[PDB]
Design a protein around this ligand. Structure first.
Ligand code: MG
Ligand code: MG
Ligand code: MG
Ligand code: MG
Ligand code: MG
Ligand code: MG
Ligand code: MG
Ligand code: MG
Ligand code: MG
Ligand code: MG
Ligand code: MG
Ligand code: MG
Ligand code: MG
Ligand code: MG
Ligand code: MG
Ligand code: MG
Ligand code: MG
Ligand code: MG
Ligand code: MG
Ligand code: MG
Ligand code: MG
Ligand code: MG
Ligand code: MG
Ligand code: MG
Ligand code: MG
Ligand code: MG
Ligand code: MG
Ligand code: MG
Ligand code: MG
Ligand code: MG
Ligand code: MG
Ligand code: MG
Ligand code: MG
Ligand code: MG
Ligand code: MG
Ligand code: MG
Ligand code: MG
Ligand code: MG
Ligand code: MG
Ligand code: MG
Ligand code: MG
Ligand code: MG
Ligand code: MG
Ligand code: MG
Ligand code: MG
Ligand code: MG
Ligand code: MG
Ligand code: MG
Ligand code: MG
Ligand code: MG
Ligand code: MG
Ligand code: MG
Ligand code: MG
Ligand code: MG
Ligand code: MG
Ligand code: MG
Ligand code: MG
Ligand code: MG
Ligand code: MG
Ligand code: MG
Ligand code: MG
Ligand code: MG
Ligand code: MG
Ligand code: MG
Ligand code: MG
Ligand code: MG
Ligand code: MG
Ligand code: MG
Ligand code: MG
Ligand code: MG
Ligand code: MG
Ligand code: MG
Ligand code: MG
Ligand code: MG
Ligand code: MG
Ligand code: MG
Ligand code: MG
Ligand code: MG
Ligand code: MG
Ligand code: MG
Ligand code: MG
Ligand code: MG
Ligand code: MG
Ligand code: MG
Ligand code: MG
Ligand code: MG
Ligand code: MG
Ligand code: MG
Ligand code: MG
Ligand code: MG
Ligand code: MG
Ligand code: MG
Ligand code: MG
Ligand code: MG
Ligand code: MG
Ligand code: MG
Ligand code: MG
Ligand code: MG
Ligand code: MG
Ligand code: MG
Ligand code: MG
Ligand code: MG
Ligand code: MG
Ligand code: MG
Ligand code: MG
Ligand code: MG
Ligand code: MG
Ligand code: MG
Ligand code: MG
Ligand code: MG
Ligand code: MG
Ligand code: MG
Ligand code: MG
Ligand code: MG
Ligand code: MG
Ligand code: MG
Ligand code: MG
Ligand code: MG
Ligand code: MG
Ligand code: MG
Ligand code: MG
Ligand code: MG
Ligand code: MG
Ligand code: MG
Ligand code: MG
Ligand code: MG
Ligand code: MG
Ligand code: MG
Ligand code: MG
Ligand code: MG
Ligand code: MG
Ligand code: MG
Ligand code: MG
Ligand code: MG
Ligand code: MG
Ligand code: MG
Ligand code: MG
Ligand code: MG
Ligand code: MG
Ligand code: MG
Ligand code: MG
Ligand code: MG
Ligand code: MG
Ligand code: MG
Ligand code: MG
Ligand code: MG
Ligand code: MG
Ligand code: MG
Ligand code: MG
Ligand code: MG
Ligand code: MG
Ligand code: MG
Ligand code: MG
Ligand code: MG
Ligand code: MG
Ligand code: MG
Ligand code: MG
Ligand code: MG
Ligand code: MG
Ligand code: MG
Ligand code: MG
Ligand code: MG
Ligand code: MG
Ligand code: MG
Ligand code: MG
Ligand code: MG
Ligand code: MG
Ligand code: MG
Ligand code: MG
Ligand code: MG
Ligand code: MG
Ligand code: MG
Ligand code: MG
Ligand code: MG
Ligand code: MG
Ligand code: MG
Ligand code: MG
Ligand code: MG
Ligand code: MG
Ligand code: MG
Ligand code: MG
Ligand code: MG
Ligand code: MG
Lengths: 62, 100, 88, 92
RNA sequence: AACCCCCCGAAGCCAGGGAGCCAAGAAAAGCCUCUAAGCACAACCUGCGGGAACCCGUACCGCAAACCGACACAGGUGGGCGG
RNA sequence: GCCGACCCGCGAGGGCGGCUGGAGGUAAGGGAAGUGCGAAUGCCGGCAUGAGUAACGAUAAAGAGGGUGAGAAUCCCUCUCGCCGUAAGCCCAAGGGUUCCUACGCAAUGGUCGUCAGCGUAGGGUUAGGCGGGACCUAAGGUGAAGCCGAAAGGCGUAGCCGAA
RNA sequence: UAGCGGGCGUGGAUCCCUGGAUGUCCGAAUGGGGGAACCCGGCCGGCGGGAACGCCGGUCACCGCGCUUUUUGCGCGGGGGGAACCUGGGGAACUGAAACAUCUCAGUACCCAGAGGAGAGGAAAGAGAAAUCGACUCCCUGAGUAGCGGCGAGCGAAAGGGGACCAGCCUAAACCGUCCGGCUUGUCCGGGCGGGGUCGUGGGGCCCUCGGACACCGAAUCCCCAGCCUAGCCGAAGCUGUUGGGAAGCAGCGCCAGAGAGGGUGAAAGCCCCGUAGGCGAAAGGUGGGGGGAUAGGUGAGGGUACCCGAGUACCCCGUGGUUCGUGGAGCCAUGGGGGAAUCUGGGCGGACCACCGCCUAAGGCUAAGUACUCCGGGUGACCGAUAGCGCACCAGUACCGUGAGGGAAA
């Protein structure tokens, strides 16, 4: 259901849009690295966080 | 697609073999193998466990899947086929001669 | 080759040697052979510049006749090959 | 895109002996310049790199059953952070 | 820790050395110099300061059990050191 | 499918009975054919004989003690003996591609054995402005604007470009 | 595709159909290089402190045609691929002849260029004996006839008749107008554009007499819809005994049937499950003259003038090809070489040639359908059932083999 949620947020991301798109993506990107960085060490990772964040990025990218 | 079939998660009769006549709520339905889990076919697995984690696993005689054909849905009247009628809007399924 | 006003690819065809009388009999001996189109080079002035033509001997005049049609055409400025193209 | 160049920290005593010095090393994108590594880790850990080193690591070939297999290739990068700074993230 | 004398000594270095001989012994860029166009507040040249410096290879085998010989095969494989 | 000393048929074959086997089979009467195998130095596969035979791959060569281990002539250590030493030692290039290292392990690979390994599982391991190569040059050659030639495919080919131990 | 680990779904996920997005690198491969999957770069913009350095987005191959003032630019297009089918250019030998050379195999195999859902062909300078037929292709027949033939081996038509399909158009030239440039200024010459013209009972042009607009014919082009393809959905009728591990077997009493095809369910079920008969369905993409509409286009009688009616062409001769036709009495079609016309008192053909009678109008182009094939989807089988059947029922063009082309299993 998280889809309907984030979607509206993105045309909502039309304060600055292409610019905030980029700002927001870059952010989600870091969170992703921070994530897999901790995922590699083992004792700081669950799971579904990644794929959810991965696809999260995708629709932002759209 | 099309994998769909008889009933889902609810009350159902078993016209199988070792558990003919029996009745119970189907706690699971795996469409891939076309079988459903009820309360009938429950066999004893001797295995300790496949995964080393959690030492004690169970000599449990848990529920064994069952071909989704030997089980039939049911309502006020016992054991009935499934017709379907389109509601005033949606799409509900009436039994042999009653509702739901 | 052959390309020009002409357009005559050289074609191959039998050259069969016969031995005979004619009003007594006539026998043979066959083989394949290539007939080339008598074609010559044709240099010509045409506006500025000069311009040649790897043309058949048959259609030699057709060139000169076409050099006439070209008088009624507007052409200039470095056009060696290009002339040929625009030259009908 | 910039957090895409750095993939994950390499976990080796050899990688650890590097923390003792100013040398933090980790997995990086196969197609990546020592130059683009610099600016990437720089703006990823708020530090300043002075010197960068790179290796390719031909993926070892594992197998299962009768099925031959090939592990993906990777790129090591070892960076020298300016004398007098650190990555508490890598420290753990 | 001593780490110094004496002797032998290269085919190697100085190197584009020399002599003789006939069979008469690569090219191009770097580097230097000349001037065109252009330009001469440029540009080039020497020095100092500050900054910048990518891509690929680098394990191991390598006269052999890891290369070519169906084989941990008495065979085969170019260069250097070889007390 | 395996067994039969029974029954019918001249015979190919048919039937009945026992054991196995566990999901198919197809009268009478007709129809259609990939229709019957012992040989083809036939084809594919399986298993024999030779035979516990020949051989175990350089005549440089071994021995003992201790250790590890279910298990040791064969793995580890020590001492003794022997062989190479313009090599059977050391470095580089080609080719080979993880065989390097460590931990665990021996079904198979190793011409015996094997705890060992170049072997199985997993983890690690290759760091360059100066070394080699490319952001330099050209060689034979190759390519190939122009240009020339050839039924088509294509063949020569200047400049340029590629090409190095 | 189980398991460790963690999630999502009637606020309708997974999944299926349609359209869109992203889509590294190589490959026609296209900035350049190159040992495909790699290496180096120019220009404009952006990122980093960023001038050196690196990264990111955009752009830069070559050829052809048209536009452009040579040029530089701008636009449309081409390139490479495809099982078989198709068309053109080139084109074998084994073999047959019981040797072999003509001949046969065969215009086959194959190499090459090109076309496309087809391709080719196509509205008579035809057929050929009927004062007859009426584009083209395809099938049946004609016919193993006619005929060709070291008259050996062999090879082998056509007209006509029965069918499928059905359709016919555009232009060159005379003649009128215009714009441009060339030059010896002219009622001109040529080039481009427009109108006109398109035929064989000969037609057209220009000059005369006349009734045609509102007459009719009408697409092969464009437009709307129907219908169909790409997901789906509805779908009748059974229950108790009984042997059994297990009923769908057996016994008892019923029921449906526009559905008793088939498959599944612990064994042999119309009524248990999926189906079947019958019947519904598309917002989106594709298809679509089948139905309708519109436009392009086209349509006449008689008389004079004799202007035009496709040129290195017809025609003739030398060399050859195609056809049933092997130089034969050898035409017709096609054309490498030489000579070389006429525009309807023109010119080709009816198997040498001549006369007679009749046929048809060459030298420019386009045209659907019937036809071929099967990579792909579906349906059906007196088709196979793992030595069969495709080489592959199974992670096969794989393992393995070979420098390579290539070979190619088992399971
Ligand atoms: Mg933007
Ligand atoms: Mg994921
Ligand atoms: Mg966006
Ligand atoms: Mg748990
Ligand atoms: Mg227990
Ligand atoms: Mg040519
Ligand atoms: Mg005579
Ligand atoms: Mg001449
Ligand atoms: Mg001149
Ligand atoms: Mg020429
Ligand atoms: Mg010109
Ligand atoms: Mg021009
Ligand atoms: Mg032009
Ligand atoms: Mg490096
Ligand atoms: Mg594994
Ligand atoms: Mg595999
Ligand atoms: Mg892989
Ligand atoms: Mg993979
Ligand atoms: Mg992987
Ligand atoms: Mg000293
Ligand atoms: Mg000497
Ligand atoms: Mg010198
Ligand atoms: Mg020198
Ligand atoms: Mg000298
Ligand atoms: Mg001197
Ligand atoms: Mg140069
Ligand atoms: Mg000067
Ligand atoms: Mg001067
Ligand atoms: Mg200083
Ligand atoms: Mg670079
Ligand atoms: Mg090294
Ligand atoms: Mg080394
Ligand atoms: Mg060594
Ligand atoms: Mg050797
Ligand atoms: Mg090997
Ligand atoms: Mg070998
Ligand atoms: Mg050995
Ligand atoms: Mg010495
Ligand atoms: Mg009996
Ligand atoms: Mg009897
Ligand atoms: Mg008998
Ligand atoms: Mg029996
Ligand atoms: Mg039996
Ligand atoms: Mg039968
Ligand atoms: Mg034999
Ligand atoms: Mg023998
Ligand atoms: Mg065998
Ligand atoms: Mg034996
Ligand atoms: Mg024996
Ligand atoms: Mg013996
Ligand atoms: Mg031996
Ligand atoms: Mg012996
Ligand atoms: Mg012996
Ligand atoms: Mg021996
Ligand atoms: Mg002792
Ligand atoms: Mg020990
Ligand atoms: Mg033992
Ligand atoms: Mg011992
Ligand atoms: Mg010595
Ligand atoms: Mg090397
Ligand atoms: Mg090998
Ligand atoms: Mg060990
Ligand atoms: Mg072993
Ligand atoms: Mg063993
Ligand atoms: Mg051996
Ligand atoms: Mg042990
Ligand atoms: Mg040991
Ligand atoms: Mg250094
Ligand atoms: Mg060069
Ligand atoms: Mg050269
Ligand atoms: Mg060439
Ligand atoms: Mg060019
Ligand atoms: Mg050259
Ligand atoms: Mg070069
Ligand atoms: Mg998975
Ligand atoms: Mg699972
Ligand atoms: Mg597990
Ligand atoms: Mg899509
Ligand atoms: Mg779009
Ligand atoms: Mg992207
Ligand atoms: Mg690119
Ligand atoms: Mg590319
Ligand atoms: Mg391009
Ligand atoms: Mg290229
Ligand atoms: Mg650049
Ligand atoms: Mg670029
Ligand atoms: Mg820039
Ligand atoms: Mg600044
Ligand atoms: Mg700036
Ligand atoms: Mg770019
Ligand atoms: Mg482009
Ligand atoms: Mg450009
Ligand atoms: Mg340009
Ligand atoms: Mg271009
Ligand atoms: Mg090129
Ligand atoms: Mg080019
Ligand atoms: Mg160009
Ligand atoms: Mg010019
Ligand atoms: Mg120019
Ligand atoms: Mg030009
Ligand atoms: Mg141009
Ligand atoms: Mg230019
Ligand atoms: Mg251009
Ligand atoms: Mg094509
Ligand atoms: Mg022959
Ligand atoms: Mg004969
Ligand atoms: Mg003979
Ligand atoms: Mg012949
Ligand atoms: Mg023939
Ligand atoms: Mg031919
Ligand atoms: Mg068709
Ligand atoms: Mg067609
Ligand atoms: Mg056509
Ligand atoms: Mg045609
Ligand atoms: Mg045509
Ligand atoms: Mg015909
Ligand atoms: Mg047919
Ligand atoms: Mg017949
Ligand atoms: Mg004949
Ligand atoms: Mg013949
Ligand atoms: Mg023939
Ligand atoms: Mg007929
Ligand atoms: Mg007919
Ligand atoms: Mg016109
Ligand atoms: Mg005119
Ligand atoms: Mg004119
Ligand atoms: Mg005019
Ligand atoms: Mg004209
Ligand atoms: Mg015209
Ligand atoms: Mg007109
Ligand atoms: Mg008129
Ligand atoms: Mg008209
Ligand atoms: Mg008219
Ligand atoms: Mg006509
Ligand atoms: Mg007239
Ligand atoms: Mg109409
Ligand atoms: Mg439409
Ligand atoms: Mg509709
Ligand atoms: Mg019951
Ligand atoms: Mg029952
Ligand atoms: Mg029975
Ligand atoms: Mg039926
Ligand atoms: Mg039955
Ligand atoms: Mg049934
Ligand atoms: Mg239906
Ligand atoms: Mg629907
Ligand atoms: Mg409908
Ligand atoms: Mg269409
Ligand atoms: Mg349409
Ligand atoms: Mg529609
Ligand atoms: Mg139609
Ligand atoms: Mg109209
Ligand atoms: Mg009228
Ligand atoms: Mg008159
Ligand atoms: Mg007249
Ligand atoms: Mg006139
Ligand atoms: Mg006139
Ligand atoms: Mg003409
Ligand atoms: Mg004639
Ligand atoms: Mg002939
Ligand atoms: Mg002939
Ligand atoms: Mg012929
Ligand atoms: Mg023939
Ligand atoms: Mg003859
Ligand atoms: Mg001729
Ligand atoms: Mg005339
Ligand atoms: Mg006339
Ligand atoms: Mg006349
Ligand atoms: Mg007349
Ligand atoms: Mg006349
Ligand atoms: Mg006649
Ligand atoms: Mg008459
Ligand atoms: Mg005729
Ligand atoms: Mg005509
Ligand atoms: Mg058709
Ligand atoms: Mg099919
Ligand atoms: Mg088998
Ligand atoms: Mg078998
Ligand atoms: Mg398969
Ligand atoms: Mg599978
Ligand atoms: Mg094999
Ligand atoms: Mg090989
Ligand atoms: Mg073979």
């Amino acid at each position: 259901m998280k889809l309907s949620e984030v979607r509206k947020q993105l045309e909502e991301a039309r304060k600055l849009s292409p610019v905030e798109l980029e700002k927001l993506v870059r952010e989600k990107k870091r969170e992703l690295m921070e994530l897999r960085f901790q995922a590699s060490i083992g004792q700081l990772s669950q799971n579904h966080k990644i794929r959810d964040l991965k696809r999260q990025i995708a629709r932002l990218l759209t | 697609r099309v994998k769909m079939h008889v009933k889902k998660g609810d009350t159902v009769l078993v016209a199988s073999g070792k558990y003919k006549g029996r009745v119970g709520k189907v706690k699971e339905v795996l469409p891939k193998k076309y079988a459903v889990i009820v309360e009938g076919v429950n066999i004893v697995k001797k295995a300790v466990r496949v995964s080393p984690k959690y030492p004690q696993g169970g000599f449990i005689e848990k529920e064994a899947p069952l071909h989704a054909s030997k089980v039939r849905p049911i309502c006020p009247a016992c054991g009935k086929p499934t017709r379907v009628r389109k509601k005033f809007l949606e799409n509900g399924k009436k039994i042999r001669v009653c509702a739901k | 080759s052959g390309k020009r006003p002409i357009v005559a690819n050289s074609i191959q065809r039998r050259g069969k040697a016969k031995r005979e009388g004619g009003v007594g009999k006539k026998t043979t001996g066959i083989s394949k052979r290539r007939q080339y189109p008598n074609l010559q080079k044709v240099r010509v002035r045409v506006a500025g510049q000069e311009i040649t033509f790897r043309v058949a001997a048959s259609h030699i005049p057709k060139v000169y006749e076409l050099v006439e049609r070209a008088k009624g055409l507007r052409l200039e400025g470095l056009s060696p090959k290009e002339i040929k193209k625009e030259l009908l | 895109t910039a957090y895409d160049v750095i993939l994950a920290p390499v976990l080796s005593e050899k990688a650890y002996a590097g923390f003792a010095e100013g040398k933090y090393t980790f997995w990086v994108h196969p197609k990546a310049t020592k130059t683009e590594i610099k600016n990437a880790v720089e703006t990823a850990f708020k530090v300043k790199v002075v010197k960068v080193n790179t290796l390719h690591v031909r993926g070892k070939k594992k197998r299962l059953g009768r099925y031959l297999g090939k592990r993906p290739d990777r790129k090591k990068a070892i960076v020298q952070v300016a004398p007098g700074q650190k990555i508490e993230a890598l420290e753990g």
